[PDB]
Ligand binder design. Structure first.
Ligand SMILES: [Zn+2]
Ligand SMILES: [Zn+2]
Ligand SMILES: [Zn+2]
Length: 96
């Protein structure tokens, strides 16, 4: 059997309180952007990866270092050293 669940649904996305489900249901119409390509700081969404990649260009950031396991990056090597730690279960090659 099922009891059911309900409650208030605020447009946290922007911060608009909506009690009438009918209202919100449509309110979303505005927030319609399911693009996995979004800036790090800006709220811009691109369809094609490249698009986002280029957008990052304008942003002056010196990140010569780049992790292997993850596409992560750091301005200094030191930072990367501590970052790696994260990768605890790094399944890879190992002789012996
Ligand atoms: Zn909203
Ligand atoms: Zn940006
Ligand atoms: Zn990493």
């Amino acid at each position: 059997g099922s009891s059911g669940s309900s409650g208030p649904h605020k447009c946290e996305v922007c911060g608009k309180c909506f009690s009438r489900k009918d209202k919100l249901k449509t309110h979303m119409r505005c927030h319609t952007g399911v693009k996995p390509y979004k800036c790090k700081t800006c709220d811009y969404a691109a369809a094609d990866s490249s698009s986002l990649n280029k957008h990052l260009r304008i942003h002056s950031d010196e990140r010569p270092f780049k992790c292997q396991i993850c596409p992560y990056a750091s301005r200094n090597s030191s930072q990367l050293t501590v970052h790696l730690r994260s990768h605890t279960g790094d399944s890879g090659p190992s002789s012996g």
